[PDB]
């Protein structure tokens, strides 16, 4: 079991770590049919999604997707410093797999 | 940064909690405030423990018990001497004043003073270190316009206040008031975003 | 996949963007039968609803509708600036499809 | 569809608006069997409940009853001004049907 | 319907009202199997639990038990003054049935 | 039924108490498949996980795992002092079973 986000990320294909060390600049959330997703940006212009749930996610990932939207919504509002994001880079925008917050 | 300021105040911690912080005696006027100082919309603080203790020794010498609150820096604060300049009436005080007072979360902790003897620091649970440490005092250029001199005072026709003179200055007092009210509204709104967002970081959509 | 709220909105019929760049003036919610909904306003008098769930909504939107109402209440209480709303304009009040928040 | 709480309340025969324009003085909740409810009061003595879920509620109300209790607890802890309550006045204490919050 | 915690509490056998008028001193929660509970204490040493869900509980109580744990957590974290608890006194530690918060 | 985290911890095999009296230094959360976990650290170097829900868990533990990750996030973002953690020490990182917060 990985002890940090970087080791976690390395277990998967098509991922990379972005190091932001910055708060989230924008949080966007949608309930539109087939676009039930969130999108975050940072001030350097970097953009990331939490994906619409589908068959690329296993059942166990379904609740974790919901938790990530809770977390990103409140991280945004709380201005918490995002250390790193682990994301799938086979998607546009890049899709979040993991986040770490620290100061 | 993580600089701290200090204020002697006879109001106990339980009252500070209930009030939402250290509040001023609402008229908001720095000039008038500067002429423990908490009138006209601002609350005074000192740049050192020993300073605040001395202020309390002479002003609150009479209360069996008072408190020295330790306070973080944030953009609700003005260096009085920088904002008022040569017209700072008591510039030996080295005062930093909090416009609308000091919200509870900006309070790091407090010492108890009993019969002149300072205790033994009590940490405030409401404090948010990362938030307040990433904040500083307001630059004086945010305060020049809230200086709050009378419309006739020579400051409004002099640098730097000449370029920040509220309408009618140099209803001047009307505008000084509404600019301070606006500043305080905008400031408090940021603090409630921070504390009340924290209070809602328990929400878990999936579980129900 | 869309990168921001504007492009997202443009994917649907009967939608438009409202740019508010302001906090929510009022939050209303109801558990009254057939009116299980939320209504928000802004100081400019603009009024928006999160729709009562119904046959116009597909199953995947139901969870998102619930998250959106929370999101509005949270934004109301923290006085957070709402940048944009994407809404369906074939409804009265206009019905929220998505929200962006940027400081 | 109604644009505000007043208009929403008037669609029901057994309801009334209370205007409080004040924060909640006390919040009470119970998990005792057959009393899984909340009760709030105001400074002026006015007392309101969120009813236990029962046969008088349709399915769509069940989730909304849970959200209302969420809303009241957070409203209480943040000292949010409650503007109006729409309540059923054929219950004692009157039973909350909707809430509005405005500064 | 009861209008307060004291009257609510008196509808049950083996319950009594505790009066704290104080913030929670400590909040403890476990995910350990068979000990899925919460324990709070006050600075006078008084200790209370929200019980592990079991046979003594009817279905309508399952969500209220979960809600009470949410409530005790945020209370503790916000330093909210607890007024009274209704407790079952035939359990050790005394098991919470209800809570009121007021200043 | 135990009255504190220390007595609770001692009921299980391969656990131990960690006394931290410190706020959480970092919070990490993942929705990646089979790594649906959270990891926290403290400034003294210690790292802990909430485990991926698995077959070591009974069904009553599932909701409690979710609650615990909720608890760690609000603790992190409110800088709540963690008093003690009860953890399983046959896991790397050590796995959280219970948390206590005071002071
Ligand atoms: Na600071």
Range of the structural domain that residue B125 is part of: 1-208
Cβ separation D8–C26 shorter than 8 A? no
How many residues are given for chain E?
103
DSSP letter for each residue of B57-91: HHHSTT-SEEEEEEEE--TTEEEHHHHHGGG-SSG
Q: How far off is chain E from F60, nearest CA to CA, in Å?
A: 7
Q: How far off is chain D from B20, nearest CA to CA, in Å?
A: 11
List the beta strands (DSSP E) in E1-103: 15-22, 26-30, 38-41, 47-50, 82-88, 94-102
Q: Which of these, F77, E79, E40, lies nearest to B124 by C-alpha position?
A: E79
DSSP letter for each residue of C18-77: EEEEE--SEEEEE-STT---EEEE-TTS-EEEEPPP-TTS-HHHHHHHHHHHHHHHHHHH
Q: How was this structure determined?
A: X-ray
Going by the DSSP 8-state scheme, the letter that residue B52 receives in this structure is H
Closest chain A CA to residue F35: A8
Which chain F residues have a beta carbon less than 8 Å from that of E42? none
Residues with Cβ–ion distance below 5 A, ligand 1: B 72-73, 132, 135
What distance in angstroms lies between residue A41's CA and the mean position of ligand 1's atoms?
A: 26
State yes or no: B8 annotated in a binding site. Answer: yes
Cβ separation B204–F70 shorter than 8 A? yes
Which of C58, C96, C98 has its CB closest to that of A28? C98
CA distances in angstroms from C3 to A32, A75, A91, D82, listed in the order given: 15, 20, 11, 37
Q: How far off is chain C from D50, nearest CA to CA, in Å?
A: 10
Half-sphere exposure of E102 (CA within 13 A, CB side): 18
List the beta strands (DSSP E) in chain F: 15-23, 26-30, 38-41, 47-50, 81-88, 94-102
Range of the structural domain that residue D100 is part of: 1-103
Cβ separation A74–B193 shorter than 8 A? no
Neighbours of chain D (3+ CB pairs under 8 A): B, C, E
Contact (CB, 8 A) for C98 and C8: yes
Residue B15 catalytic? no
Question: How many domains are there within chain A?
Answer: 1
The tokens of E51 are what? 């019980």
CATH number of the domain enclosing C27? 2.40.50.110
B201 vs C: CB within 8 A: no
Q: Is E46 exposed, middle or buried (0-12, 13-18, 19+ CB in 10 A)?
A: middle
Strands C94-102 and C82-88: antiparallel
Contact (CB, 8 A) for F80 and F101: yes
Cβ separation B204–A78 shorter than 8 A? no
Q: Count Cβ neighbours within 10 Å for each residue of C65-96 and write b for 16 or more, e otherwise.
A: bbbbbbbbbbbbbbbbbbbbbbbbeeeebbbb
Which of B196, B203, B208 has its CB closest to that of D78? B196
């Amino acid at each position: 079991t990985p002890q940090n986000i970087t080791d976690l990320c390395a277990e998967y294909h098509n991922t990379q770590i972005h190091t932001l060390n910055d708060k989230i600049f924008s949080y966007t959330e949608s309930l539109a049919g087939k676009r039930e997703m969130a999108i975050i940006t940072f001030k350097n212009g970097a953009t990331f999604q939490v994906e619409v749930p589908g068959s690329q996610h296993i059942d166990s990932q379904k609740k974790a997707i919901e938790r990530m939207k809770d977390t990103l919504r409140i991280a945004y509002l709380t201005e918490a410093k995002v250390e790193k994001l682990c994301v799938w880079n086979n998607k546009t925008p890049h899709a979040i797999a993991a986040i770490s917050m620290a100061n | 940064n993580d600089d701290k300021l200090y204020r002697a105040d006879s109001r106990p911690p339980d009252e500070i909690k209930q009030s939402g912080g250290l509040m001023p005696r609402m008229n908001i006027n720095l000039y008038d405030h500067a002429r423990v100082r908490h009138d006209d919309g601002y609350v005074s603080t000192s740049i050192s423990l020993r300073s605040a203790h001395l202020v309390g020794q002479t002003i609150l010498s009479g209360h069996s018990t008072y408190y020295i609150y330790v306070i973080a820096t944030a953009p609700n604060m003005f260096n009085v001497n920088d904002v008022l300049g040569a017209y700072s009436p008591h510039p030996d005080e080295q005062e930093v004043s909090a416009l609308g007072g000091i919200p509870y979360s900006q309070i790091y902790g407090w010492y108890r003073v009993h019969f002149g003897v300072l205790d033994q620091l009590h940490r405030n649970r409401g404090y948010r270190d990362r938030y307040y440490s990433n904040l500083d005092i307001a630059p004086a250029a945010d305060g020049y316009g809230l200086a709050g001199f009378p419309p006739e005072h020579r400051a409004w026709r002099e640098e730097p206040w000449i370029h920040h003179a509220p309408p009618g200055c140099g209803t001047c007092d009307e505008k000084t008031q509404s600019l301070g009210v606006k500043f305080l509204d905008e400031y408090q709104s940021k603090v409630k975003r921070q504390i009340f967002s924290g209070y809602q970081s328990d929400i878990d959509t999936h579980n129900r």
